[PDB]
Design an enzyme around this catalytic site. Structure first.
Site, PDB file in Angstrom:
ATOM      1  N   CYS A   1       0.855  -1.178   0.000  1.00  0.00           N
ATOM      2  CA  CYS A   1       0.000   0.000   0.000  1.00  0.00           C
ATOM      3  C   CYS A   1       0.902   1.243   0.000  1.00  0.00           C
ATOM      4  CB  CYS A   1      -0.894  -0.017   1.248  1.00  0.00           C
ATOM      5  SG  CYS A   1      -1.767   1.523   1.597  1.00  0.00           S
TER       6      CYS A   1
ATOM      7  N   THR B   1       0.972   3.573   1.852  1.00  0.00           N
ATOM      8  CA  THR B   1       1.420   3.849   3.217  1.00  0.00           C
ATOM      9  C   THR B   1       2.693   3.077   3.599  1.00  0.00           C
ATOM     10  OG1 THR B   1      -0.792   4.468   3.983  1.00  0.00           O
ATOM     11  CG2 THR B   1       0.756   3.735   5.670  1.00  0.00           C
TER      12      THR B   1
ATOM     13  N   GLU C   1      -1.601  -5.155   4.433  1.00  0.00           N
ATOM     14  CA  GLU C   1      -2.620  -5.748   3.570  1.00  0.00           C
ATOM     15  C   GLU C   1      -2.191  -7.205   3.438  1.00  0.00           C
ATOM     16  OE1 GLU C   1      -2.916  -3.759  -0.248  1.00  0.00           O
ATOM     17  OE2 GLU C   1      -4.232  -2.194   0.538  1.00  0.00           O
TER      18      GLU C   1
ATOM     19  N   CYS D   1     -11.709  -3.820  19.843  1.00  0.00           N
ATOM     20  CA  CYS D   1     -11.796  -4.492  21.133  1.00  0.00           C
ATOM     21  C   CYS D   1     -13.259  -4.645  21.541  1.00  0.00           C
ATOM     22  CB  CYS D   1     -11.030  -3.706  22.205  1.00  0.00           C
ATOM     23  SG  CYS D   1     -11.858  -2.215  22.842  1.00  0.00           S
TER      24      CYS D   1
ATOM     25  N   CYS E   1     -13.975  -0.262  24.297  1.00  0.00           N
ATOM     26  CA  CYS E   1     -13.582   1.125  24.538  1.00  0.00           C
ATOM     27  C   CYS E   1     -14.678   2.091  24.086  1.00  0.00           C
ATOM     28  CB  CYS E   1     -12.270   1.450  23.818  1.00  0.00           C
ATOM     29  SG  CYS E   1     -12.383   1.469  22.016  1.00  0.00           S
TER      30      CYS E   1
ATOM     31  N   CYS F   1     -10.901   2.183  17.254  1.00  0.00           N
ATOM     32  CA  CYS F   1     -10.633   1.548  18.546  1.00  0.00           C
ATOM     33  C   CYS F   1      -9.286   2.052  19.063  1.00  0.00           C
ATOM     34  CB  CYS F   1     -10.598   0.029  18.370  1.00  0.00           C
ATOM     35  SG  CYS F   1     -10.013  -0.907  19.792  1.00  0.00           S
TER      36      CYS F   1
ATOM     37  N   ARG G   1      -2.336  -2.870  -7.702  1.00  0.00           N
ATOM     38  CA  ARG G   1      -1.938  -3.706  -6.582  1.00  0.00           C
ATOM     39  C   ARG G   1      -1.151  -4.923  -7.046  1.00  0.00           C
ATOM     40  NH1 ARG G   1      -2.847  -0.183  -3.723  1.00  0.00           N
ATOM     41  NH2 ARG G   1      -3.512  -0.176  -1.512  1.00  0.00           N
TER      42      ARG G   1
END
Ligand code: K
Ligand code: K
Ligand code: ZN
Ligand code: ZN
Ligand code: ZN
Ligand code: ZN
Lengths: 373, 373
Positions: free
Chosen positions: A44, A46, A67, A96, A99, A110, A368
């Site tokens: 990705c 990122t 990914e 979770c 929270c 989360c 991708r």
């Protein structure tokens, strides 16, 4: 009992350098942890951002990747919802379910383990990775660039055991983010006029989402016209190259939509394009969603008049999906042909060639690249 | 037949100078126009802004004023919905009921006469005001600072005949804007945590709206502590002065609310404060509404991260109320005691003393000064 596993992993020793395929050791899962055998993973934008060294939060050495898709190899004590053999997808946005964020239907962020995750550590403050006597950090709580990874038990989505992992690993970020931006963040109505800036993986997923939602028009926007063909295949009614015009792109969009689009999505991470995306929205009810992640320090800007006269500025993370409950449903939507995934795969490589995936991304030739572990 | 009317009006011959009580001529209502006898009016920060001369598109001379209430004196050709004697409130935000905006439930920004209105003219491109042989411009389509004014027939709200005009004239802008910002734009839910920046008429109206919506916590924020007492009377659970803290106000609010507010409202028109209002919002679901109008060329800014992690930036004009259909209902809510109006009146003056209303604006425990015509 669960022993230490010796396996291969693509280690990022330092920023600005390619990944190195190394022999590493993966410790067994501790309480509320799950060790996963990664079957397929992809790159990705990122992952590349962190590898570049431009990320102020980036720390090395580290095993990147978020990914991915695999099979549970073993679980730590206290873990009962998961077991060896389960088909899963690692999640960088956990759930979770306890929270204040998990309990609020308006968000999927989360916060239960974000502090340790930001430090590349498991919830107990330590890493399960070592290589040549050195501690190797986790990344985004997933570290999918390894034959085996360990994640918090709340960072796991159990999916359809028949799902082709060399395809659904993509639901780990890109596809889910763009798709969710449309149906979760924007919640666009049938007949809406949309504009999508950036026609890469995320942008294509947004278009896919706009089509599923029944948009009447979907205008793809990118300076690389090579991306247009696939954008139309995904649903774009037309594509425009900002370089073909001598006026700001927002003015072009306003002109071709008689006032502006109902919904716009920025899928690049460019603050200037973000402003453009907002300003291309129709007066009175236009909504722009920031999907891409901009470089640190960079700010978005516009005149308040834009908001006062009816436009709304929003953003999204992982498409707004409460991860653990949503990812399995997204896989099912893929299995039932409601959404596309295969169409996102443009290249395939072996684990040893993982650096080519980074090269293909940087060159912009692909959408991708799926890496077979 | 409708004759030309000779009456008194407060004329602004130029910027930076006090309004001058002049004797003017008000032409009869042309086709689809309505001549109103103004009974009461008040001064809004916007009137003062235009008069200051700091407004780019502010023209002169002009008859300002947009918060008023009166009675229909006569109507022009084609007007059948209104007649002499009807109790009404002049609207700077029309509702032709046929344009793309009026037909869209998501906005109240009718565009049918925006162009001519911005030029201080009636729909036909001419002005009905003259004084000393000079043509006097209209203002915001209302020009309430006159014993008689002429407006487009779509700029009229017909209200309850029993309504105290020396009160409901305030529903012409301030109150309606702040109130609507809360219940229409934000649509805050019961129990919501809110922050209101700027405790003037608009701000108090926002506080009022938050209370009507069932807000749990309502934090008033202003550098002038003299505004706190009334803020609490309207429902503020507490007030804070940014000057009493070293940290930026958004950090103070985040700390006070364990993460940030659910909804913030900027009612000052300061881009720096608009940024703080947005960043003061809680991660994942926070929403900030810009209610104030910033100076020309000034822009708001923030890191896109704020939006990506869940915050939303919005704005509102006249509280998002479809004017012609909403104002009557707002008058009824006041009459039935659902909302306050009387509590906004801090001073009362005669028409000749209108300039004092402006002097009182630049400071105080002064919210709205009602001018009796
Ligand atoms: K929507
Ligand atoms: K709401
Ligand atoms: Zn990603
Ligand atoms: Zn949680
Ligand atoms: Zn209209
Ligand atoms: Zn006003």
């Amino acid at each position: 009992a669960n022993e230490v596993i010796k396996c291969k992993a693509a280690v990022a020793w330092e920023a600005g350098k390619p990944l190195s395929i190394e022999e590493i050791e993966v410790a067994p899962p501790k309480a509320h942890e799950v060790r996963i055998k990664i079957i397929a993973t992809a790159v990705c934008h990122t992952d590349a951002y962190t590898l570049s060294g431009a990320d102020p939060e980036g720390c090395f050495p580290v095993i990147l990747g978020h990914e991915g898709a695999g099979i549970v190899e073993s679980v730590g004590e206290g873990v009962t919802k998961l077991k060896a053999g389960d088909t899963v997808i690692p999640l960088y946005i956990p759930q979770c379910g306890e929270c204040k964020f998990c309990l609020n239907p308006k968000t999927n962020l989360c916060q239960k383990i974000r502090v340790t995750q930001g430090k590349g550590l498991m919830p107990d403050g330590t890493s399960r990775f070592t290589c040549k006597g050195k501690t190797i950090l986790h990344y985004m709580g997933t570290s999918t660039f390894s034959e085996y990874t360990v994640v918090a038990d709340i960072s796991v989505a159990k999916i359809d055991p028949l799902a082709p992992l060399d395809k659904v690993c993509l639901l780990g970020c890109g596809i889910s983010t763009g798709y969710g931006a449309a149906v979760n963040t924007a919640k666009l109505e049938p007949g809406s006029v949309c504009a999508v800036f950036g026609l890469g993986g995320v942008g294509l997923a947004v278009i896919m989402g706009c089509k599923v939602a029944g948009a009447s028009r979907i205008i793809g926007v990118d300076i690389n016209k090579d991306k247009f063909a696939r954008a139309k295949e995904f649903g774009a009614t037309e594509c425009i190259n900002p370089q073909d015009f001598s006026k700001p792109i927002q003015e072009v969009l306003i002109e071709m939509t008689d006032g502006g689009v109902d919904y716009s999505f920025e899928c690049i991470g460019n603050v200037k394009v973000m402003r453009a995306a907002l300003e291309a929205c129709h007066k009175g009810w236009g909504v722009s969603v920031v999907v891409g992640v901009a470089a640190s320090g960079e700010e978005i800007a516009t005149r308040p008049f834009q908001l006062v006269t009816g436009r709304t500025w929003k953003g999204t993370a992982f498409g707004g999906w409460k991860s653990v409950e949503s990812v399995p449903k997204l896989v099912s939507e893929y299995m039932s042909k409601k959404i596309k995934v295969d169409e996102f795969v443009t290249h395939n490589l072996s684990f040893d060639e993982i650096n080519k995936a980074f090269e293909l991304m940087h060159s912009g030739k692909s959408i991708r690249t799926v890496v077979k572990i």
